[PDB]
Symmetry: C3
Subunit: 116 residues, 3 copies
């Protein structure tokens, strides 16, 4: 199997595949796709309940430059991802409006190659 | 493969895995997770069209004590589940506001282990 | 693996399975299920931005005669599908309110057999 997961704390990027790998980590919360195929993106955002800064609550999942998911709910744990056919060079990134909107000890996302 | 499905009638819990199993049935509509891993929960709620009792319409999917899905639509067949990384000891349960809100001959949920 | 995908242009139905096959193409955008099992339907609708005809915007996914997904958003790329236990004889079809509501060079759907 080829899969990767970022977080939650203490972990950053964790990876497991054969050679050649299907993905490579770019930086915290961001990955590049190295093989064409059918992937399942998964994970969860646990929103910090006592978040009281001025930035509105929003978490955004990016495929390349385009948002593919917006999470707007400050109370409940919400799933990230879905099923995506992805191509070589694509990136996936999870971006928080404020690093404190979220509980990084219970926030993560990952990916698994399902098929070519 | 490791998988399990509850219902629909006439069936209750049906299971198939190797030893040791990845899940074990707790009771009707309720399962315990026995291995850490990436699961896909699936299934459907077929709402009883002629439901006329006082209880409002709602079906709830639970992970442990927390609702992970609420189904509020009394007319259409609606999918249950999604992709969840689950841990040893976790339960998943499907709870109906009234056993008659739903058509148990066309209502079920199941689970498959995707990866460790 | 057993899988099939329609589109995007230039492609129509593309298939790959062992014998006997799990699905067979009926016609453009429409497939029949030949084996009972757990499938994942995937894909995306890329809405034509400059769509200005009288037909309202809607894309519908059908399981047999019943809509299982409605896509109503004229601006963003939106995912199609989810996880469905499907039976022999079932059809899946993707229907557009107007063939021009959508960019067929970036519109497709596919299916993969996950388990029996």
């Amino acid at each position: 199997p080829c899969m990767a997961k970022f977080g939650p704390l203490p972990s950053k990027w964790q990876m497991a595949s054969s050679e050649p790998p299907c993905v490579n980590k770019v930086s915290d919360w961001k990955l590049e796709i190295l093989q064409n195929g059918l992937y399942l993106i998964y994970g969860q955002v646990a929103p910090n309940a006592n978040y009281n800064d001025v930035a509105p609550f929003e978490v955004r999942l990016y495929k390349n430059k385009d948002m593919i998911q917006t999470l707007t709910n400050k109370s409940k744990i919400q799933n990230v991802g879905g099923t995506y056919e992805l191509h070589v060079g694509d990136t996936i990134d999870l971006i928080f409006n404020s690093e404190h909107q979220v509980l990084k000890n219970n926030t993560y996302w990952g990916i698994i190659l399902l098929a070519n």
